[PDB]
Amino acid sequence: GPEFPNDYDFMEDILDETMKSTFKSEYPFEKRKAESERIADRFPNRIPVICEKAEKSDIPEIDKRKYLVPADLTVGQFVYVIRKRIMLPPEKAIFIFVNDTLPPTAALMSAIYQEHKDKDGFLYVTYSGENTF
Ligand SMILES: CNC[C@H](O)c1ccc(O)c(O)c1
């Protein structure tokens, strides 16, 4: 029994480039920057991470794509949380990319933030499975 949003049919069999849509392209830069600035004030010791599903990847979608990551949390630990959230069976694979790269699983998310944070203050991560449509 899928949990939200995976009780919805996304109709991937006709999803087009005219329909692709992500956090950056759905919300104005200025609104995004103001939100991460608010988080720096209100949750100072959290790293704000936008985590979204790679395009056409064969893996469940995620409800909350916005994470308040503890500063000393490793990449390995963050991957485990996403796995948990999409209820991915342990026998199926999951990878996260930063700048189209697999970060080293022992790396602190704080370090990845300092190296790769967006002009808008967020860290953008992409997750995917082994296959894609
Ligand atoms: C699609 N029909 C309802 C939906 O499947 C649904 C309802 C309650 C839930 O807790 C749930 O995970 C999914």
Numbering used by the authors: 1 to 133
Task: Show me the paper's own sentences about this structure.
Landmark proteins called autophagy receptors bind specific targets and interact with Atg8-family proteins on the isolation membrane through the Atg8-family-interacting motif (AIM) (also called the LC3-interacting region, LIR). The first aromatic residue and the fourth aliphatic residue bind to two hydrophobic pockets in Atg8 (the W- and L-sites, respectively), and the main chain of the motif forms an intermolecular parallel β-sheet with a β-strand (β2) of Atg828. Nonetheless, deletion of the short helix from RTN3245–264 reduced the interactions with mAtg8s.
To elucidate the structural basis of the Atg40–Atg8 interaction, we determined the crystal structure of Atg8 N-terminally fused with the C-terminal sequence of Atg40 (Atg40237–252) containing the AIM (Y242-D-F-M). As with canonical AIMs, the first and fourth residues Y242 and M245 bound to the W- and L-sites of Atg8, respectively. In addition, the second residue D243 formed salt bridges with the R67 residue of Atg8. Moreover, the Atg40 region C-terminal to M245 assumed a helical conformation, and D247 in this helix formed salt bridges with R67 of Atg8. Residue F238 on the N-terminal side of the core motif also interacted with I21 and the aliphatic portion of R20 of Atg8. We prepared two “wild-type” peptides, Atg40234–252 and Atg40237–252, because the former peptide with the M245A and D243A D247A mutations could not be synthesized. Our structural analysis revealed that residue M245 bound properly to the L-site on Atg8; thus Atg40 is the first example of a protein in its class that uses methionine at the fourth position of the AIM. However, in Atg40, the main chain at M245 was included in the C-terminal helix, and thus distant from Atg8, enabling accommodation of methionine’s long side chain in the L-site.
